[PDB]
């Protein structure tokens, strides 16, 4: 996301605006203003590692843009945006992740490595790998009898088609000691 | 399958279990996943976009 302080009406600010947005969700319900649009309308550009070196970035679009004029003792604890030179904003942090991790619920609540582990196991889980399993003649293949889309989810699964072709089941779980088995 | 199509490799110089590369680099932010890398042997040498 580009920042360009170029706002007559005030300080610095994300090129893209609530209009562009609603203009896309407009193209959504139609299933003519795509991604390649946001791009050619110099509202968002590609940054490789080299270039990235010479730019400043904001995490949240909002939280890192207004001035100052309490806080929830339950939410985490963010630092601040006492920066003025902001040249770009992060479309969203969660995208630092990959296909594996994007299915981990609340990864920002686990011990770093545990997420590395789960990232490995899901590639050994069972589910439905393609709806045409019935017509494919591959050696060895596993289909879960009754796939269930997971209760707790991720905005990113939405693109990994995970709700469509799940890979597990919502099991009722008791975390207790019992027979000792 | 998705995860397999976004896979990265990196050869080494034998022995080279040195960790200078294997380590999660700063610049890796945003381009590679900080959590999804294999354990042991080729850990850190195999990244995921």
């Amino acid at each position: 996301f580009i920042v360009e302080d170029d706002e007559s009406l005030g300080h610095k600010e994300l090129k893209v605006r609530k209009g562009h947005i609603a203009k896309l969700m407009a193209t959504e319900y139609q299933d003519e203003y795509t991604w390649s649009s946001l791009l050619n309308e110099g509202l968002v550009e590609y940054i490789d590692a080299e270039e990235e070196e010479s730019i400043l970035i904001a995490m949240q679009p909002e939280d890192l843009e207004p001035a100052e004029a309490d806080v929830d003792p339950a939410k985490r604890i963010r630092v601040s945006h006492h920066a003025t030179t902001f040249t770009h904003c992060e479309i969203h942090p969660s995208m630092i992740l990959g296909v594996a991790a994007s299915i981990i619920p609340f990864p920002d609540h686990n011990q770093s490595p545990r997420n590395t582990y789960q990232s490995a196991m899901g590639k050994q889980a069972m589910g439905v790998f393609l709806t045409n399993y019935n017509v494919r003649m591959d050696t060895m293949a596993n289909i879960l009898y009754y796939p269930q889309k997971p209760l707790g989810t991720t905005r990113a699964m939405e693109y990994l088609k995970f709700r469509e072709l799940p890979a597990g089941q919502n099991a009722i779980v008791a975390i207790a000691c019992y027979s000792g088995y | 399958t998705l995860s397999h199509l976004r896979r990265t490799n990196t050869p080494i110089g034998r022995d080279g279990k040195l960790a200078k590369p294997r380590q999660l680099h700063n610049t890796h932010w945003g381009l590679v996943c900080p959590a999804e890398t294999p354990e042991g042997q080729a850990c850190g040498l195999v990244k995921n976009l």
Partner: peptide, 30 residues
């Protein structure tokens, strides 16, 4: 106000749009 700021939930829209055009296997194809 088609030119107001953008909240957080609004970013998802951009993304929804990203994958609609590029898609998960982008690079392996291009």
């Amino acid at each position: 106000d088609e030119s107001a700021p953008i909240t957080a939930e609004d970013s998802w829209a951009v993304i929804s749009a990203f994958f609609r055009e590029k898609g998960l296997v982008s690079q392996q194809l291009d």
